[PDB]
């Protein structure tokens, strides 16, 4: 278990996620598989917080769980929850997730040009240059929704389209330590 | 009835002594006399002495006799951030508003001195927990990157496709 996994798992987990997840994750950094009622006992959560906490931990693969069946000393059947952190899983789910937003930024930058150019104020709904050119009545010589016959303002598309550009930068650079960490944990 | 509640009225007694500032101890039969226990059965005084007085978190053996525990309870901001930090190294876990209110009296001032220092946790029954502000290491995003993060369902796709996608990038 190299420094670097759980230096990288510390870093992804206290950065996207809440502290309650960040606590769960130490118990486990400290001991490599721990029982959920132990950690229950040591975090003091609700049962319902800490599953739901667990529940999203799995939905992410960071760490799994096995299941235990023993019989106690009195006769009675104990089923224990045991989790351990599956580092080999948590880089492979760490990939997808910064794949997926890396994809989600070149897709988001075609898709603020396909955003609709036209908005009549009266319908409150958008309308794009092809439906815009249809509405347009020859006879009339201007351009007006049908519907509502109204003069259509492009200005406020403009504004929107200009702030997903600023994002870009911030992004890359606030995201370079996780891909320094990444490179690090190749090997 | 007899035996298990006499007990009550001297600890209550010795709670409002103290919080009238009177740290000093006082003997079981001083302590006696206050509440109107002058006849206290004999083998309900040896178990005090043995069981009652030392068993109890909140009751001090010091020279014999007996005082208060303010040690233990919060009583100034310095204890508060200091037992805070315990509990996260130690990883005990945080602990109810209402225990720190009745130990810490003003507790308000504290919380609001330490500001940000302290995580609070609202329970169902509006119930505060507080947990140490751990300051190693610290990152958020602005709410449209959380909001673009849970817009992105990752709980009902499977591993196939999530390592798919992998090789599907080039990657
Ligand atoms: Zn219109």
Same mark, same amino acid.
């Given at each position: 278990?190299?420094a @670097?996994?759980?230096r990288? @798992?510390?870093?992804?987990?206290?950065?996207?996620?809440?502290?309650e997840?960040?606590? @769960?994750?130490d118990?486990l950094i400290? $001991?490599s598989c721990?029982?959920?009622?132990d950690?229950?006992?040591?975090?003091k959560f609700d049962?319902?917080?800490?599953?739901?906490?667990? $529940?999203?931990?799995?939905?992410?693969?960071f760490?799994?769980?096995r299941?235990?069946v023993?019989?106690?000393?009195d006769?009675?059947?104990?089923?224990?929850?045991?989790?351990?952190i599956?580092?080999?899983?948590?880089?492979?789910?760490?990939?997808?997730?910064?794949?997926?937003?890396?994809r989600?930024?070149?897709?988001?930058?075609?898709?603020?040009? $396909?955003?609709?150019?036209?908005?009549?104020?009266?319908?409150?709904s958008?309308?794009?240059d092809?439906?815009?050119?249809?509405?347009?009545?020859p006879?009339?010589?201007?351009?007006?929704?049908?519907?509502?016959?109204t003069?259509?303002?492009e200005?406020?598309s403009?504004?929107p389209?200009?702030?997903?550009?600023?994002?870009?930068?911030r992004?890359?650079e606030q995201?370079?330590?996780i891909?320094?960490l990444?490179?690090?944990?190749?090997d | 009835?007899?035996?298990?509640?006499?007990?009550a009225?001297?600890?209550?007694?010795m709670?409002?002594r103290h919080?009238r500032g009177d740290?000093?101890?006082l003997?079981?039969?001083?302590?006696?006399?206050?509440?109107?226990h002058?006849?206290?059965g004999?083998?309900?005084?040896?178990?005090?002495m043995?069981?009652?007085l030392?068993n109890?978190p909140k009751?001090?053996?010091?020279?014999?006799?007996?005082?208060?525990?303010p040690?233990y309870?919060?009583?100034d901001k310095?204890a508060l951030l200091r037992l805070?930090?315990?509990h996260?190294?130690?990883?005990?876990?945080g602990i109810?508003l209402?225990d720190?209110?009745?130990?810490?009296?003003?507790?308000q001032?504290?919380?609001?001195?330490?500001?940000?220092?302290?995580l609070?946790v609202?329970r169902?029954?509006?119930k505060?927990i507080l947990?140490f502000?751990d300051?190693?290491?610290?990152?958020?995003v602005?709410?449209?990157?959380?909001?673009?993060?849970?817009?992105?369902?990752?709980?009902?796709?499977?591993?196939?496709?999530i390592?798919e996608?992998?090789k599907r990038?080039?990657?």
């Amino acid at each position: 278990v190299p420094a @670097a996994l759980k230096r990288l @798992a510390k870093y992804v987990i206290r950065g996207f996620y809440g502290i309650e997840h960040a606590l @769960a994750l130490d118990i486990l950094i400290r $001991n490599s598989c721990v029982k959920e009622e132990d950690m229950l006992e040591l975090l003091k959560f609700d049962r319902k917080q800490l599953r739901s906490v667990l $529940n999203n931990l799995k939905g992410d693969k960071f760490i799994k769980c096995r299941m235990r069946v023993e019989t106690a000393a009195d006769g009675k059947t104990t089923r224990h929850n045991y989790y351990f952190i599956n580092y080999r899983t948590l880089v492979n789910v760490v990939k997808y997730k910064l794949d997926h937003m890396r994809r989600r930024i070149e897709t988001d930058e075609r898709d603020s040009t $396909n955003r609709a150019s036209f908005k009549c104020p009266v319908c409150s709904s958008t309308f794009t240059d092809l439906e815009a050119n249809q509405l347009f009545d020859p006879m009339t010589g201007t351009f007006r929704c049908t519907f509502c016959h109204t003069e259509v303002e492009e200005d406020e598309s403009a504004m929107p389209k200009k702030d997903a550009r600023t994002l870009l930068a911030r992004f890359n650079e606030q995201i370079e330590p996780i891909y320094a960490l990444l490179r690090e944990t190749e090997d | 009835g007899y035996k298990f509640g006499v007990l009550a009225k001297i600890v209550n007694y010795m709670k409002t002594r103290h919080q009238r500032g009177d740290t000093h101890p006082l003997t079981l039969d001083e302590i006696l006399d206050e509440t109107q226990h002058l006849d206290i059965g004999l083998k309900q005084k040896q178990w005090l002495m043995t069981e009652a007085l030392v068993n109890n978190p909140k009751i001090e053996v010091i020279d014999g006799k007996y005082a208060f525990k303010p040690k233990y309870n919060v009583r100034d901001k310095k204890a508060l951030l200091r037992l805070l930090d315990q509990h996260d190294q130690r990883g005990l876990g945080g602990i109810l508003l209402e225990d720190i209110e009745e130990a810490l009296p003003n507790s308000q001032k504290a919380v609001k001195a330490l500001g940000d220092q302290i995580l609070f946790v609202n329970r169902p029954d509006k119930k505060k927990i507080l947990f140490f502000n751990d300051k190693s290491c610290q990152f958020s995003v602005d709410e449209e990157f959380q909001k673009l993060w849970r817009s992105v369902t990752v709980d009902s796709m499977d591993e196939e496709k999530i390592e798919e996608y992998l090789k599907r990038q080039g990657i």
